[PDB]
Design an enzyme around this catalytic site. Structure first.
Site, PDB file in Angstrom:
ATOM      1  N   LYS A   1       1.148  -0.495  15.219  1.00 44.59           N
ATOM      2  CA  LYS A   1       2.701  -0.335  15.551  1.00 44.59           C
ATOM      3  C   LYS A   1       2.928  -1.510  16.694  1.00 44.59           C
ATOM      4  CE  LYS A   1       3.737   2.893  13.570  1.00 44.59           C
ATOM      5  NZ  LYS A   1       4.452   2.824  12.219  1.00 44.59           N
TER       6      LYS A   1
ATOM      7  N   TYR B   1       3.900   6.534  10.228  1.00 44.76           N
ATOM      8  CA  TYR B   1       3.208   5.393   9.768  1.00 44.76           C
ATOM      9  C   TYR B   1       4.099   4.384   9.036  1.00 44.76           C
ATOM     10  CZ  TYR B   1      -1.026   3.120   8.865  1.00 44.76           C
ATOM     11  OH  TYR B   1      -2.218   1.870   8.635  1.00 44.76           O
TER      12      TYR B   1
ATOM     13  N   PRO C   1      -4.247  -0.353  18.716  1.00 45.09           N
ATOM     14  CA  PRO C   1      -4.174  -0.813  17.678  1.00 45.09           C
ATOM     15  C   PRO C   1      -4.095   0.442  16.417  1.00 45.09           C
ATOM     16  CG  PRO C   1      -6.073  -1.718  18.457  1.00 45.09           C
ATOM     17  CD  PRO C   1      -5.380  -1.210  19.451  1.00 45.09           C
TER      18      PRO C   1
ATOM     19  N   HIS D   1       0.798  -1.186  -0.051  1.00 44.06           N
ATOM     20  CA  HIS D   1      -0.007   0.033  -0.031  1.00 44.06           C
ATOM     21  C   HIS D   1       0.824   1.349   0.044  1.00 44.06           C
ATOM     22  CE1 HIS D   1      -4.170  -1.711   1.390  1.00 44.06           C
ATOM     23  NE2 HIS D   1      -3.536  -2.332   0.629  1.00 44.06           N
TER      24      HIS D   1
ATOM     25  N   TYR E   1      -9.486   5.269   7.641  1.00 45.63           N
ATOM     26  CA  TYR E   1      -9.602   5.507   9.121  1.00 45.63           C
ATOM     27  C   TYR E   1     -10.712   6.661   9.086  1.00 45.63           C
ATOM     28  CZ  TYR E   1      -5.005   3.289  10.685  1.00 45.63           C
ATOM     29  OH  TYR E   1      -4.332   2.222  10.563  1.00 45.63           O
TER      30      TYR E   1
HETATM   31  C1  LIG Z   1      -7.406  -5.795  16.983  1.00 44.44           C
HETATM   32  C2  LIG Z   1      -5.657  -5.694  16.707  1.00 44.44           C
HETATM   33  C3  LIG Z   1      -5.233  -5.162  15.734  1.00 44.44           C
HETATM   34  C4  LIG Z   1      -3.924  -5.042  15.622  1.00 44.44           C
HETATM   35  N1  LIG Z   1      -3.315  -4.592  14.460  1.00 44.44           N
HETATM   36  C5  LIG Z   1      -2.030  -4.498  14.130  1.00 44.44           C
HETATM   37  C6  LIG Z   1      -1.556  -3.857  12.968  1.00 44.44           C
HETATM   38  O1  LIG Z   1      -2.116  -3.923  11.822  1.00 44.44           O
HETATM   39  N2  LIG Z   1      -0.051  -3.910  13.134  1.00 44.44           N
HETATM   40  C7  LIG Z   1       0.772  -3.895  13.931  1.00 44.44           C
HETATM   41  O2  LIG Z   1       1.961  -3.823  14.182  1.00 44.44           O
HETATM   42  N3  LIG Z   1      -0.064  -4.367  15.167  1.00 44.44           N
HETATM   43  C8  LIG Z   1      -1.120  -4.601  15.285  1.00 44.44           C
HETATM   44  N4  LIG Z   1      -1.702  -5.263  16.615  1.00 44.44           N
HETATM   45  C9  LIG Z   1      -0.795  -5.768  17.466  1.00 44.44           C
HETATM   46  C10 LIG Z   1      -0.084  -7.360  17.398  1.00 44.44           C
HETATM   47  O3  LIG Z   1      -1.355  -8.234  17.141  1.00 44.44           O
HETATM   48  C11 LIG Z   1       0.515  -7.682  18.626  1.00 44.44           C
HETATM   49  O4  LIG Z   1       1.564  -6.793  19.276  1.00 44.44           O
HETATM   50  C12 LIG Z   1       1.306  -8.993  18.430  1.00 44.44           C
HETATM   51  O5  LIG Z   1       0.487 -10.103  18.410  1.00 44.44           O
HETATM   52  C13 LIG Z   1       2.493  -9.202  19.755  1.00 44.44           C
HETATM   53  O6  LIG Z   1       3.294 -10.355  19.335  1.00 44.44           O
HETATM   54  P1  LIG Z   1       3.740 -11.236  20.596  1.00 44.44           P
HETATM   55  O7  LIG Z   1       4.135 -12.396  19.664  1.00 44.44           O
HETATM   56  O8  LIG Z   1       4.798 -10.670  21.503  1.00 44.44           O
HETATM   57  O9  LIG Z   1       2.760 -11.784  21.657  1.00 44.44           O
HETATM   58  P2  LIG Z   1       1.455 -12.697  21.196  1.00 44.44           P
HETATM   59  O10 LIG Z   1       0.614 -12.425  20.037  1.00 44.44           O
HETATM   60  O11 LIG Z   1       0.726 -12.334  22.314  1.00 44.44           O
HETATM   61  O12 LIG Z   1       1.853 -14.266  21.435  1.00 44.44           O
HETATM   62  C14 LIG Z   1       2.355 -14.640  22.459  1.00 44.44           C
HETATM   63  C15 LIG Z   1       2.301 -16.331  22.977  1.00 44.44           C
HETATM   64  O13 LIG Z   1       2.703 -16.221  24.174  1.00 44.44           O
HETATM   65  C16 LIG Z   1       2.099 -17.538  24.850  1.00 44.44           C
HETATM   66  N5  LIG Z   1       1.979 -17.707  26.082  1.00 44.44           N
HETATM   67  C17 LIG Z   1       1.424 -16.719  27.135  1.00 44.44           C
HETATM   68  N6  LIG Z   1       1.806 -16.881  28.240  1.00 44.44           N
HETATM   69  C18 LIG Z   1       2.525 -18.182  28.036  1.00 44.44           C
HETATM   70  C19 LIG Z   1       3.118 -19.207  29.463  1.00 44.44           C
HETATM   71  N7  LIG Z   1       2.939 -18.812  30.645  1.00 44.44           N
HETATM   72  N8  LIG Z   1       3.701 -20.102  28.868  1.00 44.44           N
HETATM   73  C20 LIG Z   1       4.111 -20.301  27.411  1.00 44.44           C
HETATM   74  N9  LIG Z   1       3.516 -19.463  26.391  1.00 44.44           N
HETATM   75  C21 LIG Z   1       2.688 -18.631  26.791  1.00 44.44           C
HETATM   76  C22 LIG Z   1       0.715 -17.202  24.497  1.00 44.44           C
HETATM   77  O14 LIG Z   1      -0.199 -18.452  24.570  1.00 44.44           O
HETATM   78  C23 LIG Z   1       0.649 -16.759  23.018  1.00 44.44           C
HETATM   79  O15 LIG Z   1       1.035 -17.746  21.986  1.00 44.44           O
HETATM   80  C24 LIG Z   1      -3.065  -5.411  16.676  1.00 44.44           C
HETATM   81  C25 LIG Z   1      -3.520  -6.004  17.765  1.00 44.44           C
HETATM   82  C26 LIG Z   1      -4.963  -6.072  17.923  1.00 44.44           C
HETATM   83  C27 LIG Z   1      -5.683  -6.671  18.993  1.00 44.44           C
END
Ligand SMILES: Cc1cc2nc3c(=O)[nH]c(=O)nc-3n(C[C@H](O)[C@H](O)[C@H](O)COP(=O)(O)OP(=O)(O)OC[C@H]3O[C@@H](n4cnc5c(N)ncnc54)[C@H](O)[C@@H]3O)c2cc1C
Ligand SMILES: Cc1cc2nc3c(=O)[nH]c(=O)nc-3n(C[C@H](O)[C@H](O)[C@H](O)COP(=O)(O)OP(=O)(O)OC[C@H]3O[C@@H](n4cnc5c(N)ncnc54)[C@H](O)[C@@H]3O)c2cc1C
Lengths: 391, 391
Positions: B297, B385, B293, B72, B201
């Site tokens: 970021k 952005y 969200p 995009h 948006y």
């Molecule tokens: C509606 C929405 C839209 C979003 N849109 C965007 C976007 O367009 N672009 C962007 O950059 N960001 C966006 N974000 C953010 C992004 O989704 C998150 O920052 C990202 O998923 C985090 O990655 P992570 O791997 O750190 O953690 P997570 O995605 O939270 O995964 C972590 C893992 O840890 C595991 N876990 C937890 N506790 C334990 C335990 N005690 N033992 C073992 N494993 C465990 C969980 O089960 C999970 O599998 C959005 C978020 C939401 C809610």
């Protein structure tokens, strides 16, 4: 589903609060991460204060305790080749302590609830608390893959040190006080007759040792070990040799050894959070604080939080005086801190610390000499041991 | 068992760090509480920065992205009957954003690891971290009822907002910064062709709305809802009516509705912890911080933590320069805070807040008017952005 008080955790705190409340007509659900089996497997506590003994009677779960529990009128401390007994009865004005295992107290409460018909959900996965500051908070969990919602008025986190409750309060709202000791406790439960009719706490150059019991044919021994120790590095043979080595010869030669039923290492720490509540969430037991096992105050402090919580909830429901719940933390912490100070004192006088200088070693020795030699000294240990009065 | 880097959590952060490390010869184990199924069910992110697109190529998992991902060159903001487009390409100096779902990025990384043969333990229960400050820390978990021990040099908590890692650092060591917004986001994933080739948006009196996509035949829409809303109170019919109501007529009449594949409500918040490490424990992704969200970021900030963590671990193993790990938090937070400020700015200009006075409403309107009308205004939104440069 909808309940009045949602209780997280089914260890002694939750079970005790569930039973106290149910008996007074206040409905409550208990959510537990584990199986009834795992909860019943935790050996833990042995010494109970008369405060909890009374609260169990008040909750109507004392038949078995009053039969199997051992009422102790004294404890014995050993140091520098001496063995000094503290007569708790005489020095505290007639109070005593009861020895009855936590596994038993927990078993009795579980059976009582089982009979009462009050709700209990074991294997309640991924509990998350919601809208704690609202007028209507809710708890969500997963049972068999399906996420359920539970509605309630108040929530009581009786989920121990590693529970979800304390984690659910905003960090910026809680002030943590903590101390981690450089050692742990290696315990060993054996089906052997205890070395004495009373408990023997002992200071020795090799480290701390404790001679405890569960009944006349069941014993529980502990020895101080570094945090670096693995329980599989400690065979039964090695534990007996080490225990024998830290006790007075006369006590060591009357010892009846045997294979272990249970054997595990527990790390020592002090931990207090302030305050103990947030909106409709009140913390009780280990969720809110940890005390070193040295002074036998953990389960007993939980009993008092749970007694104070129940009594305030009675006034809230029964009398509509819900403004008293604001005082929960204030009341509780006054007791918690004094029991924290004793547990800390006991730990520091009975244990060998790494890198202690000549002056410290000597002051540790003189503390025991003074306290155990003074009438006023002994009275301070006694009143604290039997349990300082509930507010 | 013994690994070099133990990674807690198998969401994008863990999977990405596991793959980056494995490719450079550093062994790593990933422990995950859930099933591969549940992880793959989380819809989440849609917009990726060129920084992550490059890190995926560097980790060799980009075949599918380069084929299915949509590049995009602009975004559109709508307010007061106007629809203003921001040309990201021109205003940022040629950078762009790629739309490719998190479920896809996570799927691709899972398959890559599956092929690589590197260790992954799904359904790793009750993970506890130990001796974080020691020279040799270990992680313990339960697999099928038996408690295993995993030894490692370092540990990386990629376990999201509700993980065990952040909880494993002493409270007194962390300083928390948090803000909880009075609303959430009700999302709805449909197998329908998106209303525009770019994201829209939108600020509207009824509340915020966002028109997004996953591909040419898959869409993702969001609308602002109060935190009091239950997703079962929002039927498909009601979501479409509400979305249509918040968009410009010309956009609303070209909308192709349809049944929902997924529909869920996500609460908005900002959260940062300082520092991001403790001994041999380094936090990455949501474990360390949450951004609303609104600015897209979250996943992108995780990518940068994971890039900075991997590069420092290379120097640590490969070059023996382990003293650089001390700078992990310093480097990361500089980026985290700027992205936190943008996500906060975006949220405050695009959303309707409860109990906003006449002056505030007006200032919210003028912010959009100024920023979207000034060349220098637009350039600030664009560079933020597309993504501020990695350190
Ligand atoms: C509606 C929405 C839209 C979003 N849109 C965007 C976007 O367009 N672009 C962007 O950059 N960001 C966006 N974000 C953010 C992004 O989704 C998150 O920052 C990202 O998923 C985090 O990655 P992570 O791997 O750190 O953690 P997570 O995605 O939270 O995964 C972590 C893992 O840890 C595991 N876990 C937890 N506790 C334990 C335990 N005690 N033992 C073992 N494993 C465990 C969980 O089960 C999970 O599998 C959005 C978020 C939401 C809610
Ligand atoms: C070796 C040792 C000796 C001790 N000796 C004594 C003694 O002699 N006398 C004394 O007073 N004290 C003693 N203590 C202390 C006492 O054992 C504890 O204070 C007491 O067990 C705490 O009670 P609790 O019910 O609050 O929590 P717990 O006993 O920790 O039980 C809490 C329950 O919460 C559940 N849970 C946790 N998280 C969740 C979740 N997220 N969802 C649902 N449920 C969850 C757990 O699975 C657990 O069942 C001793 C402790 C030790 C380790």
């Amino acid at each position: 589903m909808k309940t009045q008080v949602a209780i997280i955790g089914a260890g002694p705190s939750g079970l005790l609060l569930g039973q106290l409340l149910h008996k007074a007509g206040i409905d409550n659900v208990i959510l537990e991460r584990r199986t009834p089996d795992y909860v019943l497997g935790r050996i833990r506590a042995g010494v109970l204060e008369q405060g909890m003994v009374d609260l169990l009677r008040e909750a109507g779960v004392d038949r078995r305790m009053a039969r199997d529990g051992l009422v102790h009128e004294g404890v014995e401390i050993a140091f520098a080749g001496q063995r000094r007994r503290i007569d708790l009865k005489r020095l505290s004005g007639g109070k005593t302590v009861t020895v009855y295992g936590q596994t038993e107290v927990t078993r009795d409460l579980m059976e009582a609830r089982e009979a009462s018909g009050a709700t209990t959900v074991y294997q309640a996965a991924e509990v998350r608390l919601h809208d704690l500051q609202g007028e209507r908070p809710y708890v969500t969990f997963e049972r068999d893959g399906e996420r359920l919602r539970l509605d309630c008025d108040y929530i009581a986190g009786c989920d121990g040190f590693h529970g979800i409750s304390r984690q659910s309060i905003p960090a910026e709202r809680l002030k943590v006080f903590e101390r981690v000791y450089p050692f742990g406790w290696l315990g060993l439960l054996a089906d052997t007759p205890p070395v004495s009719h009373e408990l023997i706490y002992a200071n020795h150059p090799r480290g701390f040792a404790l001679c405890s019991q569960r009944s006349a044919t069941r014993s529980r021994y502990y020895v101080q070990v570094p945090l670096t120790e693995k329980v599989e590095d400690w065979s039964d043979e090695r534990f007996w040799t080490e225990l024998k080595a830290r006790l007075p010869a006369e006590v060591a030669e009357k010892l009846v050894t045997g294979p272990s039923l249970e054997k595990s290492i527990a790390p020592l720490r002090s931990f207090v959070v302030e305050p103990m509540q947030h909106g409709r969430l009140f913390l009780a037991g280990d969720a809110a604080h940890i005390v070193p096992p040295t002074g036998a105050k953990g389960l007993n402090l939980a009993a008092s939080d749970v007694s104070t919580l129940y009594r305030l909830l009675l006034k809230a429901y029964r009398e509509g005086r819900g403004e008293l719940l604001e005082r929960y933390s204030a009341i509780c912490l006054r007791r918690i801190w004094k029991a924290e100070r004793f547990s800390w004192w006991m730990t520091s006088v009975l244990h060998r610390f790494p890198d202690t200088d000549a002056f410290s070693q000597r002051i540790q020795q003189t503390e025991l000499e003074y306290y155990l030699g003074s009438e006023a000294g002994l009275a301070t240990i006694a009143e604290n041991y039997v349990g300082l009065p509930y507010e």
